[PDB]
């Protein structure tokens, strides 16, 4: 259930904020990235509609999962800067 965000970059010119996001569910089942976007709306004080996470490789032996969360300054910035398949995976 616990999280860390190493290697965070502002990306001001792409208007996006990039953290190497490590999420750890010890003994819990897998993650539900949409719930992760909900949680990271709160974790970095945003809304769920301008955040998008991909990557999401759970390590060997369960628990830790490495993902890549992208926080845009606007959901429209996400719309203009986001990949098509990533948008429809988010549900837009």
């Amino acid at each position: 259930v616990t999280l860390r965000t190493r290697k965070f970059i502002r990306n001001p010119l792409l208007s996006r904020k990039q953290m190497v996001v490590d999420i750890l569910h010890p003994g819990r089942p897998n993650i539900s990235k949409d719930e992760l976007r909900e949680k990271l709306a709160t974790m970095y004080k945003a809304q769920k509609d301008q955040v998008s996470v991909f990557g999401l490789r759970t390590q060997y032996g369960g628990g830790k999962t490495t993902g890549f969360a992208l926080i845009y300054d606007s959901p429209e910035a996400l719309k203009k800067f986001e990949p098509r398949y990533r948008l429809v995976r988010a549900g837009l």
Binding site: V1, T2, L24, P26
Partner: protein, 145 residues
């Protein structure tokens, strides 16, 4: 992690039961086990170890004892530390070298030799036979960061 009160990770590599561990404000460890005479500097979030083996090397020569076990550790700064072995050995070490920087034997001297009165139940107490004293060695260590 006490913040969520959970287990996060373990580390193995110790041939002995680990006797002592010291730490600092960074994400590292140092951990000594006894009969291997070995300190281990744990690089925690990358999960590596740095092995450090002691090999202990006007008095009777027999009383001088090598590094029997490896009892206490004190991490002083990010790069040096010290070990205390129960044969009275006090050894400053560097991360940068494989070798101890500086060890001193009989850090608390030798033990008092026992009486002939309790060593032998003889009406004649003879010092011709008597064991050599063992080195009064380290039970505990501390340092301030």
């Amino acid at each position: 992690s006490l913040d969520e009160l959970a287990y996060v990770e373990t580390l193995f590599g110790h041939q002995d039961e680990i006797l002592d561990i010291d730490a600092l404000g960074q994400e590292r460890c140092v951990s000594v086990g006894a009969r291997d005479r070995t300190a281990r500097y744990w690089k925690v979030p990358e999960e590596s170890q740095l092995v450090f083996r002691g090999g202990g090397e006007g008095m009777d020569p027999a009383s001088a004892a090598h590094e029997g076990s490896m009892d206490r550790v004190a991490m002083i700064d990010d790069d040096m530390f010290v070990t205390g072995s129960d044969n009275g050995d006090l050894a400053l070490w560097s991360i940068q070298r494989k070798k101890p920087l500086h060890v001193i034997a009989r850090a608390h001297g030798l033990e008092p030799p026992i009486k002939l009165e309790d060593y032998s139940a003889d009406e004649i107490p003879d010092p011709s036979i008597i064991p050599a004293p063992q080195p009064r060695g380290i039970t505990a260590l501390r340092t301030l960061p």
